[PDB]
Design a protein around this nucleic acid. Sequence first.
RNA 1: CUUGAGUCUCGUAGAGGGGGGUAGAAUUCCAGGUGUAGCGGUGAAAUGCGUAGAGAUCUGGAGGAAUACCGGUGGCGAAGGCGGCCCCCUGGACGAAGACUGACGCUCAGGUGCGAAAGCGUGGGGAGCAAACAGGAUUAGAUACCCUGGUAGUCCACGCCGUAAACGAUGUCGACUUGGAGGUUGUGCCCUUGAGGCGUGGCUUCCGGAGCUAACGCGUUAAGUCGACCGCCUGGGGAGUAC
RNA 2: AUAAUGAAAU
Lengths: 117, 66, 70, 106
Amino acid sequence: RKQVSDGVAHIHASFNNTIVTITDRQGNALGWATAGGSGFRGSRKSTPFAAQVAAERCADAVKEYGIKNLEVMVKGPGPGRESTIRALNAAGFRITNITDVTPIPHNGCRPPKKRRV
Amino acid sequence: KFCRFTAEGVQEIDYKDIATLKNYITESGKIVPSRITGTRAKYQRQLARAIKRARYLSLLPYTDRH
Amino acid sequence: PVIKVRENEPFDVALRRFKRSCEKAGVLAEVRRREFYEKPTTERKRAKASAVKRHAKKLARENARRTRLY
Amino acid sequence: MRHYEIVFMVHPDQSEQVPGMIERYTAAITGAEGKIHRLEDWGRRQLAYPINKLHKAHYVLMNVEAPQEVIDELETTFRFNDAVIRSMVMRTKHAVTEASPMVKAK
RNA sequence: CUUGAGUCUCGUAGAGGGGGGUAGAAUUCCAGGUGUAGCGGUGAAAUGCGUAGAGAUCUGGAGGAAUACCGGUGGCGAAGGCGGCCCCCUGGACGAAGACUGACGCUCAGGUGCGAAAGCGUGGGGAGCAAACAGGAUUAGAUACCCUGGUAGUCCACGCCGUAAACGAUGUCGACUUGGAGGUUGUGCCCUUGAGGCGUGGCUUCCGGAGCUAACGCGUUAAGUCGACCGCCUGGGGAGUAC
RNA sequence: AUAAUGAAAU
């Protein structure tokens, strides 16, 4: 393949799952892994341990491109914000930046109604 | 509580004064509450008006990620 | 919350800076409170209740320091 | 007559028409028994966020006194001109003749 | 006649009302690039979407609804109510020092206007969510609560309807009667120590004395002490129902 | 997570 040496890791952390996607600096994808596809189902899919395992697997699945430097973008409120960043540091990359890009509306649309159970 | 505008006897806050307006916004671009900075209500209102005018004219940002 | 890792700077320090900045910005609170719709009556009621509780607690704690327990 | 403050912004690759624009608008205002209290040309500045895929706009500021029909016509000209990307018109209580913070520390 | 009630001159604060422009964040949809097995959801599940290439990430476009932070026992309005920025038309309140009119006032049966949400008629518009409706589940049953979808309506213009725990569950106007701590908006003077004190108006939150109250509590913004006018009650059901 | 009922008297 083609070497890159400089990449971005996108973390999508919801209350039910975690998705990790590694990309070049122009937004072209190279590999992905998720918490629900690493042997976890149901209640165990939303724990920091599952997020960690997914980070390890995503790091492994991109070893043919020879990446050295990584930026990190985090989006969402769920459990999995920090375990993933720790695992990426452990895997052996160099972190240059950390940014939060969680979206917030300046009073737009009406949310769904409150749950009564 | 100490208020610089009251101490200096100011009439308007001058939306063209980026240097002064920078002291009242955070690192994301949000206006700072009055109970932290110790301003008076009259001047807090004038200040919010000025900051909104500057945001529209593009001398100040809306958020730190554009 | 934008964090740039400084030269010679370890990784734990940068991570802690990230956490502190996010706490200062307060994004989790906004996300949690925007999850479901709230009616204007409920909003007004919550605000009033908070004010009354804070006032009463302040008065009680300021007036409780004039008595001896033993 | 009332007192107005005007600001307008121009495309960076059309900075060679600003003097002609200023002359034309000033003539229009002065031809109707108006006055001009302050005029300033700030040059090109970096924007805080992009507008139409641009940075680096050219800025002009004016402070005048005139009737309302003239201000209406000026706004129509701004609307239908394509060199102008943004503009603002505001009302004031008195005439302003002092210098702005942009011509004291730039 | 000038003390009640009004007119004139200078200023101040305000999401008070009607009309027209415009800006940035976010949701949905449409067309492309990279990439490959899962996504979404629950207390636990499955209906649903996916190799006909989803979800994730990057670039371009369309549309209509609401305005983070400021923002508070904060402001304005007769009540109902009113919140991004700029312009046009417009109503009320308050303060300082003077001038002017001369009781021109208070209350109001019948009458006439204004009046949240939902609903109705004609013509438009439709991201988001949502009565009705359909299918997962739970359960002895589940016409429900929880999940996946979803149209009337919610939006604009003009015209109807006239009701709400429309609440301070406390009609409008005027006079008198010990105190303490705050908020907001005007104005006068100065020991002179140029940064602080001493006064005088309008609105507003909390505590509490005499008096009052069946009690809970109210307490100069009275439910205390008085005067003028209006509306309403007379055991529980039947019934705010029938003609 | 959900999860019903008990004649009248003394």
